[PDB]
Amino acid sequence: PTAYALAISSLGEFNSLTGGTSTDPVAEGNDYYYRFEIRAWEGSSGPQTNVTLNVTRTLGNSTFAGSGTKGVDFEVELDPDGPFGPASYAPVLSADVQVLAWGPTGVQLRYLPSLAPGATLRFSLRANAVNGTNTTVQADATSTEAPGPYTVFETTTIIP
Ligand SMILES: [Ca+2]
Ligand SMILES: [Ca+2]
């Protein structure tokens, strides 16, 4: 059988850490936010542990912003019933996220609680728009139990 599975999705760029409106292109000198989801398979043989997002800049000049402050530079939200129920995304406790790395060209965030089958996490990441070269970021999802990584690339058009 398939014991455990995870998935990743890009949701594109937004003008706010939470809520707000979509964006892209972005004018150089403005902040913007990437969002990614990590999604636990509903058929998983149990909760998944060490669910980790690794995002690296692959092309262009934009930078992950700030020092790594939850609620300013990044946010992790949990939808405990995923798409399968009406519960909405809500920010998780600060203690529930370990910032493994936070720098201008790479960020790594680990969810410390276990992630129930079907549940999803939404990661929002603040960035500084820089260039008229596009910025492309690589986002990798892994967990202990799932045969990761699962990778996407999202691209932002920067106006000089
Ligand atoms: Ca839900
Ligand atoms: Ca985009």
Q: Is residue 99 part of a domain?
A: yes
Q: Is residue 46 part of a domain?
A: yes
Q: Is residue 49 part of a domain?
A: yes
Measured in angstroms, how far is the CA atom of residue 9 from the centroid of ligand 1?
16
Residue 19 assigned to a binding site: no
Q: For residue 121, with 0-12 CB atoms within 10 Å meaning exposed, 13-18 middle and 19 or more buried, which class applies? A: buried
Ligand nearest, relative to CA of residue 121: 1
Q: What domain count does the chain have?
A: 1
Q: Is residue 68 part of a domain?
A: yes
Q: What kind of experiment solved this structure?
A: X-ray
Measured in angstroms, how far is the CA atom of residue 36 from the centroid of ligand 2?
12
The two three-digit tokens of residue 93, written as one number: 């406790």
CATH code of the domain in which 86 resides: 2.60.40.740
CB 26 within 8 A of CB 20: no
Tell me the residue range of the domain where 102 lies: 6-159
DSSP strands (E only) in the chain: 6-14, 26-27, 31-40, 51-59, 63-64, 74-79, 90-91, 97-103, 106-111, 120-128, 135-142, 150-156, 158-159
Q: What is the 3-state secondary structure (H, E, C) of 85-113?
A: CCCCCEECCHHHEEEEEEECCEEEEEECC
Measured in angstroms, how far is the CA atom of residue 154 from the centroid of ligand 2?
6
Hunting for tokens 């594109």 — which residue is that?
12
Residue 31 assigned to a binding site: no
CB 48 within 8 A of CB 144: yes
Q: Is residue 1 part of a domain?
A: no
